Structures are given as C-alpha cells and as structure tokens.
Amino acid sequence: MVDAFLGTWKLVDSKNFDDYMKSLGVGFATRQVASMTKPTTIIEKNGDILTLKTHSTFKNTEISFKLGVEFDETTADDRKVKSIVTLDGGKLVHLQKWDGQETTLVRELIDGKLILTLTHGTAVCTRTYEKEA
Numbered sequence: 793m794v795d796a797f798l799g800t801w802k803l804v805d806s807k808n809f810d811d812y813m814k815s816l817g818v819g820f821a822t823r824q825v826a827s828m829t830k831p832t833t834i835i836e837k838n839g840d841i842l843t844l845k846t847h848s849t850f851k852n853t854e855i856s857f858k859l860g861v862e863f864d865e866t867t868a869d870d871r872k873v874k875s876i877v878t879l880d881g882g883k884l885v886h887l888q889k890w891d892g893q894e895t896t897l898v899r900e901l902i903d904g905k906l907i908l909t910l911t912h913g914t915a916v917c918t919r920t921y922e923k924e925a
C-alpha cells in the first residue's frame with residue numbers, strides 16, 4: 793500500500809514554503825535559512841512501523857509511526873503536536889493537531905515524483921521530491 797513512497801527523496805521544487813512557515817509563526821531568520829535548504833527525506837518500513845527522516849544542513853527530524861495510530865511529535869519548528877498518518881486515496885496524509893490548530897502534510901506520487909502539499913490556515917505549499925538511486 794505504502795511501498796512506492798519508500799526510499800530516499802531529494803527536494804527539487806518548492807512553492808510557498810515561506811507562506812506556510814510564516815502561518816506557523818516561524819521567525820524570519822529561520823524562514824530565510826529554510827528557503828535555501830534542500831532536505832533529503834528518507835521513508836523506510838519495518839513491518840507495520842514507518843520511519844520518516846528529514847535531513848538538511850539546518851535541522852534534522854525523525855518520526856516513527858504505525859499508519860492509523862496517533863503518536864506524539866515535536867516538529868522542526870518545536871511544536872508539540874498529536875499526529876496521525878494514514879493512506880487516503882493512495883496519498884500519505886499526515887495530520888498534526890495542537891492548541892486546537894491543525895496542519896496537513898499530504899504526500900502523493902505523480903509520474904514517479906513525490907509531491908508534498910503543506911496546508912496551515914490559508915497557506916498552501918507544494919514541494920516536489922525526486923528519487924535518489
């Protein structure tokens with residue numbers, strides 16, 4: 793179900809990430825560094841457990857989760873959120889909840905590229921990831 797998402801992915805296009813970060817209250821200096829960063833995302837599974845790593849020159853994160861089971865997460869911008877990841881229409885949908893707020897991180901495969909759509913408030917960001925061999 794999730795297997796075409798697995799592997800190492802490199803950022804190759806970003807649209808509106810500053811809008812998304814600003815909506816979350818990320819400070820200007822952080823947004824500035826993050827606008828030039830090209831993370832690597834690694835998605836691996838071991839049975840029912842997925843591990844999603846995001847690596848860059850500015851910040852690393854790692855989460856492990858079971859699809860459909862809530863987990864605690866501390867985001868790159870230090871929000872303490874309640875998270876759940878599920879497959880929905882073949883997309884990997886990550887919902888974060890905190891302080892009555894929500895944001896979604898939706899990953900889809902289109903022509904072998906990984907498209908990540910980030911929504912918070914009215915801000916919508918689209919990031920495109922290609923495969924690393």
Ligand SMILES: CCCCCCCCCCCCCCCCCCCCCC(=O)O
Binds near residue numbers: 822847849853869919
């Ligand atoms: C994911 C952190 C990776 C480190 C890269 C250097 C900074 C860019 C990521 C964000 C760190 C700055 C704070 C804002 C983070 C917002 C929420 C997560 C968005 C992930 C976008 C994506 O996975 O492409």
